[PDB]
Amino acid sequence: FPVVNTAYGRVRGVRRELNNEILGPVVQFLGVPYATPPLGARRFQPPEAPASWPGVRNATTLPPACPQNLHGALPAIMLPVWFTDNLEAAATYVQNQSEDCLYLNLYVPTGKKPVMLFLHGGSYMEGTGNMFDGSVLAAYGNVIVVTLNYRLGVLGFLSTGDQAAKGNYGLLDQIQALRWLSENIAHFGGDPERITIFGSGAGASCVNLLILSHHSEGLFQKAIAQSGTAISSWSVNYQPLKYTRLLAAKVGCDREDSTEAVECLRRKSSRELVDQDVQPARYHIAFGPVVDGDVVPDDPEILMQQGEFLNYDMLIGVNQGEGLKFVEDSAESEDGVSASAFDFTVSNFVDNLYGYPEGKDVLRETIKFMYTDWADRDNGEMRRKTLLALFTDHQWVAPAVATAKLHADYQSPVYFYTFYHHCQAEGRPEWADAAHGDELPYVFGVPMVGATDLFPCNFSKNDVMLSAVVMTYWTNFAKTGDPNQPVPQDTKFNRFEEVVWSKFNSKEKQYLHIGLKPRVRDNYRANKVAFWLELVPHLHN
């Protein structure tokens, strides 16, 4: 039970030991506050510094999670596959919901060590940071993995568009946890000048929105964005006042005055606000990051094109097939999806995503022709793989390449990768590969610790080898900034020895094809990526 004196008092951890023999013991400080709780009048206000406590504080038990409703109407497509499949197992973690969230979990192993802050969340109104045990990652890579809880949903992202409720309260909590780390990690042994930030899904969009901000000026140095970006359709909210008024009407006080409505919402209880069941438009979000002027000044799209950011390092990537939830109705059919429904599915994809009345018949017919296999036009079974790739390319792959190019034009080291592996789960078909959010088990060393309630995968030796490689690639980035130099790719127990990860250049757009058969490719779907970035903007507008 080591005691480490911080700048706000003293805490006490534990010395829990991992189940492996090649991993040393770690010291865990679970439940370290980093902001005064927004229990009362602090709701819909930015966080502040914590209050110092006398004596020594218990830090052993996992902290309570921010209020959320895991059995409501959450956006299903945004969530990772393992979150939706194992919903009952994931609901056990979020049981002690309370507004006294905003705690911090530290996993210190046993020069100053690096720090790796993890921004959780598949959507903007679900999840908690207790699901990810970073003890294995911290011990293997000799880094200090830290996971946090931040306000979610209405409580942390409600905005009206005016000064009454600016919004982005969840983003300010993430910045506050970075400021706390920049001032208190030296005692635990970390280095405040080598702070790495990483996430996945909606957390990855928070990483990119944190980069294009002035509040996070000199807090962290590097960044990782796994299967996420800040220019997707479901990244930022462009209709904040509309969804607030629907919420205000449902609770009971839809006052005309913006200030009056906000004050009433502060009077109501937390559970009443969370369980209101407000549903947004398809492929969008209801409550999320809102452009206000402080955190996100004007627009994520405009911000990167104007070159206004502090030039951080980056490590972007995507998976093979992430639109696995785009094709779900035709998932138990003997032979794929029929041509009657392929046209209807593609047609619906355009109204609720483009919907432009300035010429749509040409746009609808152009993408029907391109996402086809004219050499095997009447296959039928592979129309699923084509429809799955239509959603993956448009929503994930194309924005990731556009972000990598914009971050590499202004000189900044950028590393691109594609994940081509998954574990044989229970309820997933054998034709899909590397669904959304499937890189998390390997980056956190799940196969090296065994099966988990969230991951019922039966990991073989090949899955163990891949995890020891992904963690090595990720950790080397946090140590020096290049996934190759500080640590070699040795078995320590293999085609990973001879491969060198090269930078992503705007004209030589190389990447690393992570998998069981790695290879440094040259261009990821250059035909389909260029279709969405070059041709499509010339069709509707």
By CB under 8 A, tell whether 535 contacts its own copies: yes
Per-residue contact flags (x/-) with its own copies for residues 324 to 363, judged by CB under 8 A = -----------------------------------x-xx-
Q: Among 101, 129, 128, 99, which residue's Cα sits nearest to residue 117?
A: 129
Residue whose CB is less far from its own copies, 310 or 350 = 350
521 DSSP β-pair partners: 511
As a whole number of angstroms, the distance between CA 212 and CA 229 comes to 12
Cα dist from 490 to 18, 229, 494, whole Å: 22, 32, 9
Residue 98's binding partner, choosing from ligand NAG, its own copies, none, with beta-carbon cut-off 5 to 8 A by kind?
A: none
- How does 391-410 read in b/e, with b if 16+ C-beta sit within 10 Å? bbbbbbbbbbbbbbbbbbee
Q: Which two tokens stand for residue 272?
A: 């009443």
By CB under 8 A, tell whether 530 contacts its own copies: yes
Q: Which two tokens stand for residue 487?
A: 């640590």
The answer to whether 99 and 39 are in contact (CB under 8 A) is yes
Residue whose CB is less far from its own copies, 41 or 362 = 362
As a whole number of angstroms, the distance between CA 471 and CA 23 comes to 13
Cα dist from 519 to 98, 439, 512, whole Å: 47, 18, 6
As a whole number of angstroms, the distance between CA 482 and CA 442 comes to 19
In whole angstroms, how close is the CB of 508 to its own copies at the nearest point? 10
By CB under 6 A, tell whether 329 contacts ligand NAG: no
By CB under 8 A, tell whether 110 contacts its own copies: no
In whole angstroms, how close is the CB of 461 to ligand NAG at the nearest point? 8
The answer to whether 164 and 262 are in contact (CB under 8 A) is yes
Site for its own copies in 378-417 (CB under 8 A): 378
By CB under 6 A, tell whether 425 contacts ligand NAG: yes
As a whole number of angstroms, the distance between CA 89 and CA 334 comes to 31
Residue whose CB is less far from its own copies, 243 or 416 = 416
By CB under 6 A, tell whether 5 contacts ligand NAG: no
Residue whose CB is less far from its own copies, 376 or 453 = 376
As a whole number of angstroms, the distance between CA 165 and CA 175 comes to 18
Can you tell me which of 426, 430, 538, 541 binds its own copies, judged by CB under 8 A? 538
Residue 458's binding partner, choosing from its own copies, ligand NAG, none, with beta-carbon cut-off 5 to 8 A by kind?
A: ligand NAG
By CB under 6 A, tell whether 462 contacts ligand NAG: no
Residue 534's binding partner, choosing from ligand NAG, its own copies, none, with beta-carbon cut-off 5 to 8 A by kind?
A: its own copies
In whole angstroms, how close is the CB of 373 to its own copies at the nearest point? 9
Residue 60's binding partner, choosing from ligand NAG, its own copies, none, with beta-carbon cut-off 5 to 8 A by kind?
A: ligand NAG
As a whole number of angstroms, the distance between CA 265 and CA 259 comes to 10
Q: Which two tokens stand for residue 165?
A: 């409720």
Q: Which stretch binds ligand NAG (CB under 6 A): 28-36, 52-60, 76-84, 92-100?
A: 52-60
Residue 526's binding partner, choosing from ligand NAG, its own copies, none, with beta-carbon cut-off 5 to 8 A by kind?
A: its own copies
Q: Among 75, 85, 375, which residue's Cα sits nearest to residue 234?
A: 75
By CB under 8 A, tell whether 523 contacts its own copies: yes
The answer to whether 224 and 474 are in contact (CB under 8 A) is yes
In whole angstroms, how close is the CB of 423 to ligand NAG at the nearest point? 8
DSSP of 156-205: HH---SSTT----HHHHHHHHHHHHHHHHHHHHTEEEEEEEEEEETHHHH
Can you tell me which of 40, 507, 517, 541 binds its own copies, judged by CB under 8 A? 507
Residue whose CB is less far from its own copies, 242 or 377 = 377
By CB under 6 A, tell whether 452 contacts ligand NAG: no
The answer to whether 327 and 435 are in contact (CB under 8 A) is no
Q: Among 159, 338, 342, 374, which residue's Cα sits nearest to residue 248?
A: 159
In whole angstroms, how close is the CB of 85 to ligand NAG at the nearest point? 11
In whole angstroms, how close is the CB of 84 to ligand NAG at the nearest point? 16
Can you tell me which of 84, 366, 412, 510 binds its own copies, judged by CB under 8 A? 366
DSSP of 252-319: S---SSHHHHHHHHHHS-HHHHHTT-----TTS-SSS-B--SSSS-S-HHHHHHTT-S----EEEEEE
Q: Among 457, 496, 495, which residue's Cα sits nearest to residue 476?
A: 496
Secondary structure of residue 505 in the 3-state scheme: coil
With a CB cutoff of 8 Å and minimum separation 6, the contacts of 176 are 34, 35, 47, 102
Query: Considering CB under 8 A, how many residues would be counted as binding its own copies?
Result: 23
DSSP of 514-536: ESSS--EES-SSHHHHHIIIIIT
In whole angstroms, how close is the CB of 184 to its own copies at the nearest point? 49
Residue whose CB is less far from ligand NAG, 60 or 510 = 60
By CB under 8 A, tell whether 522 contacts its own copies: yes
Residue 493's binding partner, choosing from ligand NAG, its own copies, none, with beta-carbon cut-off 5 to 8 A by kind?
A: none
In whole angstroms, how close is the CB of 527 to its own copies at the nearest point? 5
Residue whose CB is less far from its own copies, 334 or 378 = 378
Q: Which stretch binds its own copies (CB under 8 A): 46-54, 230-238, 383-391, 530-538?
A: 530-538
Pairing mode, if any, of strands 104-109 and 190-200? unpaired
N- to C-terminal Cα separation, the chain: 64
Residue 429's binding partner, choosing from its own copies, ligand NAG, none, with beta-carbon cut-off 5 to 8 A by kind?
A: none
Residue 539's binding partner, choosing from its own copies, ligand NAG, none, with beta-carbon cut-off 5 to 8 A by kind?
A: its own copies
Can you tell me which of 55, 293, 357, 537 binds ligand NAG, judged by CB under 6 A? 55
By CB under 8 A, tell whether 369 contacts its own copies: yes
Binding interface with ligand NAG (CB under 6 A): 55-56, 58, 60, 424-426, 456, 458, 460
Q: Name the residues that contact its own copies, by CB under 8 A.
A: 359, 361-362, 365-366, 369, 372, 374-375, 377-378, 507, 522-523, 526-527, 529-531, 534-535, 538-539
